[PDB]
Amino acid sequence: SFVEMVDNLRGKSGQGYYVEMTVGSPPQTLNILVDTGSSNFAVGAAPHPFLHRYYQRQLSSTYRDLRKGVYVPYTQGKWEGELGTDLVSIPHGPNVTVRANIAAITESDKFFINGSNWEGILGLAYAEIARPDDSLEPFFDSLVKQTHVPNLFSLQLCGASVGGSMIIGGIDHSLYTGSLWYTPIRREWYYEVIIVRVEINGQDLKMDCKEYNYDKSIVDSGTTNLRLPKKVFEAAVKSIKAASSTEKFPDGFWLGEQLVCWQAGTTPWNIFPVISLYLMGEVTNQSFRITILPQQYLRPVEDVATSQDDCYKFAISQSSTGTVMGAVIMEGFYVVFDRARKRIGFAVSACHVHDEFRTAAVEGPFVTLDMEDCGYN
Numbered sequence: 001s002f003v004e005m006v007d008n009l010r011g012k013s014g015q016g017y018y019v020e021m022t023v024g025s026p027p028q029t030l031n032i033l034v035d036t037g038s039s040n041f042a043v044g045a046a047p048h049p050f051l052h053r054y055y056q057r058q059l060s061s062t063y064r065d066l067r068k069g070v071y072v073p074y075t076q077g078k079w080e081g082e083l084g085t086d087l088v089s090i091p092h093g094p095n096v097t098v099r100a101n102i103a104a105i106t107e108s109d110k111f112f113i114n115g116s117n118w119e120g121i122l123g124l125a126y127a128e129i130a131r132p133d134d135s136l137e138p139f140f141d142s143l144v145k146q147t148h149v150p151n152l153f154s155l156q157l158c159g160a161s162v163g164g165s166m167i168i169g170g171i172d173h174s175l176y177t178g179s180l181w182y183t184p185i186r187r188e189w190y191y192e193v194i195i196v197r198v199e200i201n202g203q204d205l206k207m208d209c210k211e212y213n214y215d216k217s218i219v220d221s222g223t224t225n226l227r228l229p230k231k232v233f234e235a236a237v238k239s240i241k242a243a244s245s246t247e248k249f250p251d252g253f254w255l256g257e258q259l260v261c262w263q264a265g266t267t268p269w270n271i272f273p274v275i276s277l278y279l280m281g282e283v284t285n286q287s288f289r290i291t292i293l294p295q296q297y298l299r300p301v302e303d304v305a306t307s308q309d310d311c312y313k314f315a316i317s318q319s320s321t322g323t324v325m326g327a328v329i330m331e332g333f334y335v336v337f338d339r340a341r342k343r344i345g346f347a348v349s350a351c352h353v354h355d356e357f358r359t360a361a362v363e364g365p366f367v368t369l370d371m372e373d374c375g376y377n
């Protein structure tokens with residue numbers, strides 16, 4: 001019954017992917033950001049300049065107040081609000097209704113994005129990182145516990161405005177080609193994984209693999225960029241600069257601040273390298289890799305001039321909180337969050353990226369010794 005969930009996600013480039021949900025009785029319809037990088041279900045519940053609608057608890061006969069406040073600080077933005085529960089449904093999802101925790105946002109700071117068309121956030125990660133603490137059951141745990149929906153979901157994020165699929169409760173084989181490759185979920189808080197090797201244009205970055213996961217590596221549909229720890233980011237930017245030195249760019253471009261533009265249809269894709277991330281596999285000493293094309297980490301953006309050029313932002317940036325495999329990394333692929341088996345699956349997506357001499361790929365097996373040394377402690 002998964003065909004009803006294909007193409008149930010929408011978005012704008014760099015403003016997140018959202019799914020339509022309803023809360024309350026009678027149903028109030030809201031667009032909810034799909035975020036595997038957090039664990040709180042939260043919606044606008046008070047007027048805001050960027051909100052076109054919001055949750056009105058007074059109009060819901062099933063609303064229950066929890067008489068507890070809550071605040072969430074993300075890497076970008078923060079909000080505070082009041083906790084409660086209400087009935088929730090996903091129109092283009094499973095045909096069920098769950099009573100779920102809902103944080104009603106009353107104040108926020110650089111959280112809602114002007115023109116993104118979503119009004120709330122659906123944190124799909126685990127209770128351990130829920131606010132105010134791990135006793136607030138996340139939505140997906142409530143869904144699995146109150147229905148027969150199997151304990152997994154999959155995300156097909158399609159690039160540039162944008163669309164995709166969230167298959168709730170299973171895997172839809174028409175959304176990917178080739179084999180699924182699985183990496184263990186290292187610990188159930190974020191969707192934490194272990195990166196064991198990094199290559200740029202086939203050259204190993206030759207860093208101690210601990211650097212790749214200092215202090216963690218997560219799969220996060222709620223973050224746009226590939227974010228890398230300082231030492232790793234510097235190494236990768238140096239390698240990407242050298243591969244593209246045929247042309248030179250402002251240093252503000254390499255920091256994500258300024259665009260780069262080219263005459264429409266003349267983007268020099270071939271001078272930007274491919275990035276290969278090797279992930280811990282399912283059997284001893286075995287890994288696999290996902291290969292990222294520049295069409296993923298050069299994010300297309302609106303024209304800042306009176307021209308019809310093709311303009312891009314560098315979508316790799318620095319982090320002080322570990323590696324973040326953001327939406328730009330996920331866009332090539334079908335990503336299976338197999339919570340039941342504590343693993344994350346990767347396969348080439350049906351909406352894969354098209355370079356003309358190169359292709360995004362998921363390839364294995366590879367042999368990698370001492371993979372467990374790559375995890376940070």
Ligand SMILES: CC(=O)COc1cc2cc(c1)C(=O)N[C@H]([C@H](O)CNCc1cccc(C(C)C)c1)Cc1cccc(c1)OCCCCO2
Nearest residue numbers: 014015016035037038073074075076077129222223224225
């Ligand atoms: C250019 C870049 O890419 C820079 O960095 C970015 C960019 C970015 C969002 C985040 C970070 C962001 O913070 N996104 C969080 C995720 O949940 C974060 N996950 C990890 C995390 C970090 C800190 C604390 C927690 C707790 C709550 C568990 C979790 C979710 C989120 C918050 C606010 C707006 C969002 C989406 O709009 C979606 C469109 C993308 C917005 O662009």
